[PDB]
Design a binder for this molecule. Structure first.
Ligand SMILES: OC[C@H]1O[C@@H](O[C@H]2[C@H](O)[C@@H](O)[C@H](O[C@H]3[C@H](O)[C@@H](O)[C@H](O[C@H]4[C@H](O)[C@@H](O)[C@H](O[C@H]5[C@H](O)[C@@H](O)[C@H](O[C@H]6[C@H](O)[C@@H](O)[C@H](O)O[C@@H]6CO)O[C@@H]5CO)O[C@@H]4CO)O[C@@H]3CO)O[C@@H]2CO)[C@H](O)[C@@H](O)[C@@H]1O
Ligand code: NAG
Ligand code: CL
Ligand code: CL
Ligand code: CL
Ligand code: CL
Ligand code: CL
Ligand code: CL
Ligand code: CL
Ligand code: CU
Length: 235
């Protein structure tokens, strides 16, 4: 159970974005139905009034929280991966348009899932803005909590993988468009019951065996990290 408070750009807080530049749902409940339109941008997908200006090569940091800013972020039980996708805003998230910019599942060295490190990072994880065409974009941050993913929602609707999905409206201003955006996957649609990483038992299968759901990260992506970039408490 977690939500996005807002974003930072190059280490500078852009301010509370909830229902402003984040298409925020009314609460922190998970999405579980893989075929629902809720998979796109969660349960209240609509245009919100602001879009955060960035340039290619900037660091864009999502900041998550549980109940209040910079709290326990997400329950520690919710071990799982984190991805970020991008699509042009014109799509409204419909069609084959989502391109993966970031994937982090399990860190063998550190013996931690992406979620574990997200908590340690005070909810902060980042991508570097790619050299796509200037214009308006949706950045879809997705946490998959796997604590009940031994079952499939489609089979048992009281269990299943949980998806915490947040779409940020981002305007890319300066960019030479040297890596124009390739084709995307659909949400809903990309994840099905057979997809690797959707059904998995984190308790009896080694985390080292986990494979996150495709698609693979676009070769045009400039990477990213799960790490605190800014101290919210200093505001
Ligand atoms: O190592 C020895 C052997 O281990 C075996 O593996 C076991 C494992 O040990 C056991 O841990 C595991 O059990 C898991 C269950 O399958 C799973 O269902 C359970 O889910 C919990 C979850 O942990 C918890 O975080 C979650 O809390 C939710 C809560 O439901 C929700 O209502 C609340 O919502 C509030 C919002 O948070 C709040 O913001 C808002 O204001 O109010 C909301 C409403 O109050 O949100 C919280 C999260 O924040 O609840 C679910 C239960 O519903 O987690 C268990 C683990 O923690 O099962 C394994 C199998 O038994 C191996 O199998 C064996 O081989 C080993 O040897
Ligand atoms: C899952 O979503 C699909 C598509 O919206 C819907 O038809 C189906 O009823 C949903 N499943 C449940 C249990 O609500
Ligand atoms: Cl839960
Ligand atoms: Cl609700
Ligand atoms: Cl759902
Ligand atoms: Cl604006
Ligand atoms: Cl950190
Ligand atoms: Cl550029
Ligand atoms: Cl589908
Ligand atoms: Cu939860």
């Amino acid at each position: 159970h977690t939500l996005v408070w807002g974003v930072w750009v190059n280490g500078v807080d852009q301010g509370d974005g909830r229902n402003i530049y984040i298409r925020s749902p009314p609460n922190n409940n998970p999405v579980k139905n893989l075929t629902s339109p809720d998979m796109t941008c969660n349960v209240d997908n609509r245009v919100v009034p602001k879009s955060v200006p960035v340039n290619a090569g900037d660091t864009l940091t999502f900041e998550w929280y549980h109940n209040t800013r910079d709290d326990d972020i997400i329950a520690s039980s919710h071990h799982g991966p984190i991805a970020v996708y991008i699509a042009p805003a014109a799509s409204n998230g419909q069609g084959n348009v989502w391109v993966k910019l970031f994937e982090d599942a399990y860190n063998v060295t550190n013996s931690t899932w992406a979620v574990d490190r997200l908590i340690t990072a005070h909810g902060q994880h980042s991508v570097v803005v790619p050299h796509v065409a200037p214009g308006d974009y949706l950045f879809r941050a997705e946490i998959i909590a796997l604590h009940e993913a031994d079952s499939l929602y489609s089979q048992n609707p009281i269990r299943g993988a949980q998806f915490y999905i947040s779409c940020a409206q981002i305007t890319i201003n300066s960019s030479d468009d040297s890596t124009p955006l390739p084709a995307g996957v659909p949400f809903p649609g990309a994840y099905t019951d057979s997809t690797p990483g959707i059904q998995f038992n984190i308790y009896t299968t080694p985390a080292t065996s986990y494979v996150a759901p495709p698609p693979s990260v676009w070769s045009g992506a400039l990477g990213g990290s799960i790490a605190q970039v800014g101290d919210a408490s200093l505001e």
